[PDB]
């Protein structure tokens, strides 16, 4: 049941899945001209189905960029598979993490772009940009988000992640306050501090963002883009609550 | 080269630093062994061979991991399958990535709560697993051995050496400190987290601090590190310089 | 489609586990389980790809700590991924494998062989706590260099591995061979390409045909019962295969 | 370290160095054919030896000019390394027996846009220069689907496990210069693994039509000089496999 979150001729932003059946994980795909961009593609456990859902929309040889927000252990199993099935892809991972690439069968880094802490920009043959923005400590030590200025969509990874209730999945947040309880425990335990959340929001508030797309949970649209950014900005998380940790 | 080293010993309780970037530690107590962050699948044939060489692998009874991935999560199923009597200690935050590593039976998995726990040994001695979250991992722990008075600190106090110039002990803190500063400023989450950790840790007796990478703190360098780390501006404190 | 009982006398069951369909699909693999007293025996359990659900299907029938023997006919690449997984979830199991390959087990994460039983070329006997036995009989070159079948004298069932294996068509799977000649198109090409020689087929047929066999249970395909048991053994003994066709292979 | 087995300026056959100054496993040979500016790997090592085999190859040729990788049959480990080689040699096609391509998913191989499945009759790799490599049938010697590779320019037969030997503890050597002291390292494996004398004879008779300066096995030492014709005569009369089956069925 794929979905188009944006479409202008050169540029589609796609929300694939799901199935009927592990947490729920989302898969997103950007089509721009004759190249594809994978966002946090599924690791080895889910790999047969994610790859077929992908080959179903775009030639796997036209995948030209694969971006990883961070080193989840269930995405890290898949780097070598994606590398070996998408010969034309560069793989983008944080430079903090590239030393572990041998430990995954990656010994040649000629298609590995280690992202600097300040971030970077992917430029495509069409002439459109993707912005990989710093998002460190939310939650991983080296962590990034991806902003598509053509589509006006922020791929947030685990920022805005939610875990659904028992068989009550849904794809879009149209009522923020009823969505928040699926979010709150994860964000307080995992996000490093309110200082980190305020800095990240103050940065994403300068981009034109119609939709925030997390890696788990529902896609934020409409009025929940504002509401999530406010809630996140004032959130006490992580070290702010570290006396209840350790306790 | 790589003769083993004894950091503590009385006949009944030994704390060992194995030879060969990454350090390997082994606590022997009575007839139990305790592995501390043993190497993952790439180093496994000789790390496993080096341990079996000091202690029978069926008397390994506890394997402790400060935090998860990839230097060591390649190895959890291997250590599980070659140490039939071991319990594996890992943060509860990560135990449901365990299927994705072929670990489907969790009857020998001890998921550590955020407040930590204690390993009690048949001898009646204890090991204290103390919280160290956000230094650097979201779920992170250190191990305190009260008999030997040694803190196994994981990456807290880690150093990356120059060239082929590794050494085992920091006997001069200030000449060692530059090998530490970049890592700790980039990785440790905030000074608030370092200050909270030092204040709990400094209530214990610590003759040595043993990190997972780098040199072991002994002598007066143990106090110098705890005071330096307590005042360290790290991580989110430098976040406008991370960002740009 | 549920699990099925091929034999039961109170203390001894031979189980043919049901299929999930849920295609998959090519072709399906069978899982069998022998329960004797309070101990279980797995026959060629699936490797790592099928392992989560294969393991749950077994755990639903028997406590995995009661599995005490795991037998592999031969060294399919589908199963060697799972040897370490089964070792770790069946703490009391010894696994029986061919000695030709016991030295290459490190390449699959198996370094301690205190629960590895290397089967010599003669075969061996699994003795069960009750005092019943399973007989591991030689089946070398049908097809792999080191290969075995398992004969259950209590249940009168031969677990044949790949001998008698069949590949089903798209949506035409079925559990039992009640019409041998209709089953033959699903079997014949494989056996002619894989089984090494008619000389090997004759030796194996003459050995197994001295045992009392109500059913033949292969690792892929349908279970032979009734008249198909002796029809299959007769077909197999006269089969021209493998090196007997080597001028047609080479060309 | 690496060795040159043939050279005419434009065509080489390499016997790559090993290992490892000290022994590991009980180990294997790696071969490399250079023709024009394109490379051919012969049974490159699986994942455990992959860091070392990969760097040894990069020392002789850019991994981007590897265009053919040939596998005699499957094991693993050699099947452990296919995904690694596929991902490090962009331009290589992998040649494997058609019996074996169904196990490819179970090793992470999902898109066979770069898999060249060999039919039982064999095939010829045609190189850009116009030279060829002959993939010749060798089925049941020992594996069900099995092939050898013959290089007509270099006059070298890469034999896979045919002619394989396991060395004694710390007495490895690179060349068979005396067949008879080499034979004890070989015969138990061949009598147990090779399917029948009938299979050995057709293969020797097939192979005897080629000019063979040298037989290069995957384990053991390379046959040269008088060992070649000594090996082919021994292998031709060998009682193996099913011929010895009533000791296997007492």
Touching subunits for chain D (3+ Cβ pairs under 8 A): A, C
The Cα B85–Cα A29 span in angstroms is 46
Burial of A88 (0-12, 13-18, 19+ CB in 10 A): middle
Kindly list the residues from chain D whose CB atom is less than 8 angstroms away from the CB atom of residue C144: 144
Which of A193, A200, A201 has the highest number of chain B CBs within 10 A, making it the mutation to test binding with B? A193
Query: Within 13 Å and on the Cβ side, how many CA atoms surround B168?
Result: 14
Domain residue extents for chain B = 1-244
D134 at C interface, C-beta within 8 A? no
Q: By three-state DSSP, how is residue C49 classified?
A: coil
Find out whether D160 and D43 touch, Cβ atoms under 8 Å: yes
Alpha helices in D98-225 (DSSP H): 179-182, 187-193, 197-207
A103 at D interface, C-beta within 8 A? no
Which of C85, C105, C107, C115 has the highest number of chain B CBs within 10 A, making it the mutation to test binding with B? C85
Kindly list the residues from chain B whose CB atom is less than 8 angstroms away from the CB atom of residue A102: 42
Measured between alpha carbons, how far is residue C102 from residues B155, C106, C220 in Å? 39, 9, 25
Nearest neighbour of C89 by CB, restricted to B78, B84, B105: B105
Pairing relationship of beta strands D147-151 and D156-160 according to DSSP bridges:
antiparallel
Find out whether C149 and C139 touch, Cβ atoms under 8 Å: yes
3-state helix, strand, coil in chain B (%, to 5): 30, 25, 45
List the C176-177 sheet strands across, edge first: C124-127, C133-138, C148-152, C157-161, C215-218, C223-225, C176-177
* Lookup: tokens for C148: 């075995």
Kindly list the residues from chain A whose CB atom is less than 8 angstroms away from the CB atom of residue D47: 105
Q: At what angle do helices D50-58 and D78-88 cross, to 10 degrees?
A: 40
Burial of A87 (0-12, 13-18, 19+ CB in 10 A): middle
**Residue in B with minimal Cα distance to A133:** B243
Distance from CA of C5 to the nearest CA of D (A): 30
Find out whether A133 and A205 touch, Cβ atoms under 8 Å: no
The Cα C168–Cα C177 span in angstroms is 12
Find out whether B170 and B176 touch, Cβ atoms under 8 Å: yes
DSSP state of C20: P
Cα–Cα nearest to C65, from A106, B200, B107: B107
Query: Within 13 Å and on the Cβ side, how many CA atoms surround D132?
Result: 7
Find out whether B94 and B137 touch, Cβ atoms under 8 Å: no
Find out whether A100 and B70 touch, Cβ atoms under 8 Å: yes
- How many residues would you count in chain C? 251
**b or e along C237-251 (b: 16 or more beta carbons within 10 Å of the residue's beta carbon)?**
eebebbbbbbeebbe
Residues 6+ apart with CB under 8 A from B136: A141, B155, B187, B188, B189, B235
Q: By three-state DSSP, how is residue D196 classified?
A: coil
The Cα A146–Cα A144 span in angstroms is 7
Find out whether B160 and B214 touch, Cβ atoms under 8 Å: yes
* Lookup: tokens for C12: 């001894």
- How many residues would you count in chain D? 250
**What's C209-243 look like in SS3?**
CCCCCCEEEECCCCEEECCHHHHHHHHHHCCCCHH
- Phi, psi dihedral angles at B8 (to 5 degrees): -160, 150
> From the CB of residue A243, how many other CB atoms can be counted at a distance below 10 Å?
9
Nearest neighbour of C87 by CB, restricted to B81, B103, B104: B81
Cα–Cα nearest to C216, from C244, C184, C177: C177
The sign of the torsion formed by the CA atoms of D132, D133, D139, D144 equals: negative
A10 at B interface, C-beta within 8 A? no
Residue given tokens 């997390």 in the structure block: A214
Contact A73 B74 (CB under 8 A): no
Nearest neighbour of C196 by CB, restricted to D106, D206, D242: D242
Burial of D119 (0-12, 13-18, 19+ CB in 10 A): middle
Distance from CA of C192 to the nearest CA of D (A): 11
Contact A81 D105 (CB under 8 A): no
* Lookup: tokens for C85: 């997984």
Nearest neighbour of A73 by CB, restricted to B97, B134, B138: B97
The Cα D159–Cα D69 span in angstroms is 15
B102 at C interface, C-beta within 8 A? yes
Contact C78 D103 (CB under 8 A): yes
Which of C107, C195, C198, C240 has the highest number of chain D CBs within 10 A, making it the mutation to test binding with D? C107
Find out whether B31 and B57 touch, Cβ atoms under 8 Å: no
**b or e along A47-58 (b: 16 or more beta carbons within 10 Å of the residue's beta carbon)?**
beebbebbeeeb
**Residue in C with minimal Cα distance to B102:** C85
Find out whether C77 and D103 touch, Cβ atoms under 8 Å: yes
B41 at C interface, C-beta within 8 A? yes
B104 at C interface, C-beta within 8 A? yes
A157 bridge partner residues: A214
B78 at C interface, C-beta within 8 A? yes
Query: Within 13 Å and on the Cβ side, how many CA atoms surround B119?
Result: 32
The Cα B139–Cα C47 span in angstroms is 32
The Cα B74–Cα A114 span in angstroms is 22
* Lookup: tokens for C211: 């045992």
The Cα C158–Cα C32 span in angstroms is 11
The Cα D226–Cα D181 span in angstroms is 13
Nearest neighbour of C250 by CB, restricted to D79, D142, D202: D202
Number of helices (H), then strands (E), in chain A? 7, 14
Pairing relationship of beta strands D93-97 and D66-70 according to DSSP bridges:
parallel
Contact C246 D199 (CB under 8 A): yes
**Residue in D with minimal Cα distance to A44:** D108
Q: By three-state DSSP, how is residue A74 classified?
A: helix
Q: What is the dihedral of CA B4, B6, B7, B8, to 10 degrees?
A: 150
The Cα D230–Cα D226 span in angstroms is 6
Distance from CA of A29 to the nearest CA of D (A): 20
Q: What is the dihedral of CA C118, C124, C129, C133, to 10 degrees?
A: 150
Q: What is the dihedral of CA A188, A191, A196, A201, to 10 degrees?
A: -80
The Cα C18–Cα C20 span in angstroms is 7
Q: By three-state DSSP, how is residue B37 classified?
A: coil
Kindly list the residues from chain B whose CB atom is less than 8 angstroms away from the CB atom of residue A140: 138
First CA to last CA across chain D, in angstroms?
Answer: 47
- Phi, psi dihedral angles at A187 (to 5 degrees): -70, -35
**Resolution for this experimental structure (Å):** 2.6
Contact C77 D80 (CB under 8 A): no
Distance from CA of C81 to the nearest CA of B (A): 10
* Lookup: tokens for D152: 């007509």
- Long-range Cβ contact pairs of D8-14 (< 8 A, separation 24 or more): D8/D153, D10/D35, D10/D36, D10/D129, D11/D35, D11/D131, D11/D153, D11/D154, D12/D154, D13/D151, D13/D154, D13/D156, D13/D216, D14/D60
| Experimental technique used to determine this entry | X-ray
Residues 6+ apart with CB under 8 A from D130: none
Residues 6+ apart with CB under 8 A from A4: A12, A13, A14, A15
Kindly list the residues from chain C whose CB atom is less than 8 angstroms away from the CB atom of residue B103: 88
Cα–Cα nearest to C109, from A115, A4, B45: B45
**Residue in C with minimal Cα distance to B78:** C109
Q: By three-state DSSP, how is residue B104 classified?
A: coil
**Residue in C with minimal Cα distance to D122:** C250
Peptide bond into B114 cis (omega under 30): no
Residues 6+ apart with CB under 8 A from D217: D29, D159, D160, D161, D162, D163, D164, D165, D223
- How many residues would you count in chain A? 247
Q: By three-state DSSP, how is residue D148 classified?
A: strand
Cα–Cα nearest to A238, from B198, B243, B93: B93
C145 at D interface, C-beta within 8 A? yes
Find out whether D6 and D32 touch, Cβ atoms under 8 Å: no
């Amino acid at each position: 049941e794929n979905e188009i979150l944006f479409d202008n001729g050169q540029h589609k932003f796609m929300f694939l899945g799901w199935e009927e059946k592990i947490v729920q994980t989302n898969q997103y795909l950007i089509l721009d001209g004759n190249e594809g961009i994978l966002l946090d593609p599924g690791g080895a456990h889910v790999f047969p189905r994610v790859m077929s859902n992908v080959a179903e929309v775009v030639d796997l040889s036209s995948i030209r960029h694969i971006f990883y927000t961070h080193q989840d252990p269930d995405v890290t199993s898949g780097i070598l598979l994606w590398l070996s099935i998408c010969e034309n892809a560069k793989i983008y991972i944080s430079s903090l993490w590239v030393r572990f690439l041998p430990h995954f069968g990656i010994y040649d880094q000629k298609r590995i772009v280690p992202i600097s802490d300040k971030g970077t920009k992917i430029k495509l043959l069409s002439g459109n940009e993707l912005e990989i923005l710093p998002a460190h400590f939310l939650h991983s030590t080296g962590n990034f988000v991806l902003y598509d200025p053509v589509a006006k969509i922020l791929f947030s990874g685990d920022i805005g992640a939610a875990v659904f209730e028992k068989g009550k999945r849904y794809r879009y947040v149209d009522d923020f306050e009823r969505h928040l309880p699926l979010m709150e425990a994860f964000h307080k335990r995992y996000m490093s501090s309110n200082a980190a959340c305020k800095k990240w929001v103050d940065m994403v508030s300068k981009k034109k963002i119609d939709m925030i797309a997390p890696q788990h949970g529902a896609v934020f649209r409409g009025e929940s883009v504002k509401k999530f950014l406010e809630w996140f900005r004032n959130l006490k998380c992580g070290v702010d609550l570290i006396d209840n940790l350790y306790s």
